Structure formats: structure tokens, C-alpha cells
Design an enzyme around this catalytic site. Structure first.
Site, short mmCIF file in Angstrom:
data_model
loop_
_atom_site.label_atom_id
_atom_site.label_comp_id
_atom_site.label_asym_id
_atom_site.label_seq_id
_atom_site.Cartn_x
_atom_site.Cartn_y
_atom_site.Cartn_z
N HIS A 27 26.71 -3.90 69.55
CA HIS A 27 27.79 -4.85 69.31
C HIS A 27 28.85 -4.69 70.38
CE1 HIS A 27 27.11 -7.10 65.46
NE2 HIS A 27 26.03 -6.34 65.53
N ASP A 60 13.24 -13.49 64.00
CA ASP A 60 14.57 -13.82 63.51
C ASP A 60 14.93 -13.02 62.24
OD1 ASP A 60 13.33 -15.15 61.35
OD2 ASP A 60 13.71 -17.13 62.05
N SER A 61 16.08 -13.34 61.64
CA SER A 61 16.53 -12.70 60.39
C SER A 61 15.58 -12.83 59.21
CB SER A 61 17.90 -13.26 59.98
OG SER A 61 18.81 -13.06 61.02
#
Ligand SMILES: CCCCCCCCCCCC[N+](C)(C)[O-]
Ligand SMILES: CCCCCCCCCCCC[N+](C)(C)[O-]
Ligand SMILES: CCCCCCCCCCCC[N+](C)(C)[O-]
Ligand SMILES: CCCCCCCCCCCC[N+](C)(C)[O-]
Ligand SMILES: CCCCCCCCCCCC[N+](C)(C)[O-]
Length: 147
Positions: A27, A60-61
Site C-alpha cells: 500500500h 480478481d477479488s
């Protein structure tokens, strides 16, 4: 115009192929490698700058196939006595698609930076928070093939 010419030249007369292997994601500002991979075509131009055309697959998620394909470009610097060291900054213009939206082609524009030695490069982007699961740095190794 020069952007149209450049993409094509990579398309028509590539000099190398590349393997892309995800390395790490973190992040921005600290707010197992990531699944996936890609391959592509590339060339070094007469300015010593990098051009690439790539196709990658991620998960993906929802754990669903998430493709991205595109063109990448980096303004490249070789500042050391060993010219094999290279650092770069540019961008990628690409297309992605998601299972949730029936894989409709969607445009993506992202920054690129890299540091490498000869055919082995650590290359990365910043995915802005405008995207779902964004505001992250995402980096991969790119391995260049053919002499
Ligand atoms: C080049 C950077 C290689 C990734 C090392 C990250 C490990 C730190 C946690
Ligand atoms: C978690 C720590 C992430 C640090 C990544 C280091 C990349 C250096 C280039
Ligand atoms: C929309 C851009 C799509 C361009 C993707 C081009 C990838 C083709 C690379 C094939 C490499 C051949 N191989 C596996 C022997 O290296
Ligand atoms: C020159 C190659 C450019 C590749 C650009 C890659 C952008 C997509 C980042 C991966 C996102 C995957 N995931 C699951 C974290 O969303
Ligand atoms: C992946 C780590 C971050 C790398 C950042 C490197 C940026 C240096 C700028 C390279 C381009 C230099 N210039 C002006 C000749 O193009």
C-alpha cells in the site's frame, strides 16, 4: 501520431519477448508473490527507450480471471560505467475487463518505473484509488529473451 507509429513498430518488428512474474504489492505509504503472470513483445528504440506490448492474467477479488493487455513505454537512463544498468519512467496504455461487467474492454492508463540489469528488470506501477482495490504499488520482474 508518433504514438501510433511507435505501438505498431513494436507490433510489427519486436526485438525480444518477455516473461512477466508478479513480485510484490504494497500500500502506498504503508496505508507469497501475487497470483498471475504475463508475456509480451518488446524492443529498445534508437533513443535507448523501452517499448512493450504485453498480455497478463490476474485473479480478481472473486478469484475470477482478470486480463490486462497493453502497450508500455519507458524513458530510459543508463547512468553507470556498466551500461547494463538501466532505470526508466513512463506509462502504460492498456485495456482490462472484469467478469462482473461481462469482460467489456475498459481503458487503463498507469505510470511505469523500473530498474534493471541487462535482461532482468524490476518494473512497477502505482494503481490509483480511483480503481477498486487500488491505491497500491504493484511490482513484477520482467525477463527479456533473445539476443
Ligand atoms: C527489490 C525489492 C524486493 C522485495 C523485498 C520486499 C521484502 C520486504 C518485506
Ligand atoms: C512491505 C514493504 C514493501 C517495500 C517494497 C520495496 C521496493 C523497493 C524498490
Ligand atoms: C493488445 C496487446 C497484446 C500483445 C501481446 C503479445 C504477446 C505475444 C508474445 C508471444 C511470445 C512467444 N513466446 C511464448 C515464444 O515467447
Ligand atoms: C508493462 C506491463 C504493465 C503491466 C501493468 C499491470 C497493471 C495491473 C496490476 C495488477 C492488478 C492485479 N490485482 C489483482 C492486484 O488487482
Ligand atoms: C523502481 C524504482 C523506482 C525507479 C525510479 C527511477 C526514475 C529515474 C528516471 C529515469 C529517466 C531519466 N531520464 C531523464 C534520462 O529519462
Amino acid at each position: 501520431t508518433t504514438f501510433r507509429e511507435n505501438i505498431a513498430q513494436t507490433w510489427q518488428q519486436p526485438e525480444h519477448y518477455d516473461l512477466y512474474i508478479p513480485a510484490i504489492t504494497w500500500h502506498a505509504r504503508f496505508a507469497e508473490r501475487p497470483w498471475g503472470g504475463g508475456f509480451g513483445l518488446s524492443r529498445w528504440d534508437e533513443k535507448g527507450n523501452w517499448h512493450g506490448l504485453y498480455a497478463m492474467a490476474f485473479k480478481d477479488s472473486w478469484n475470477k480471471w482478470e486480463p490486462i493487455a497493453g502497450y508500455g513505454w519507458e524513458s530510459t537512463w543508463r547512468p553507470l560505467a556498466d551500461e547494463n544498468f538501466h532505470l526508466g519512467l513512463g506509462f502504460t496504455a492498456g485495456v482490462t475487463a472484469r467478469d462482473n461487467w461481462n469482460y467489456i474492454p475498459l481503458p487503463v492508463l498507469l505510470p511505469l518505473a523500473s530498474v534493471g540489469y541487462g535482461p532482468v528488470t524490476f518494473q512497477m506501477t502505482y494503481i490509483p484509488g480511483t480503481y477498486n482495490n487500488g491505491n497500491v504499488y504493484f511490482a513484477w520482474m520482467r525477463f527479456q529473451f533473445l539476443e
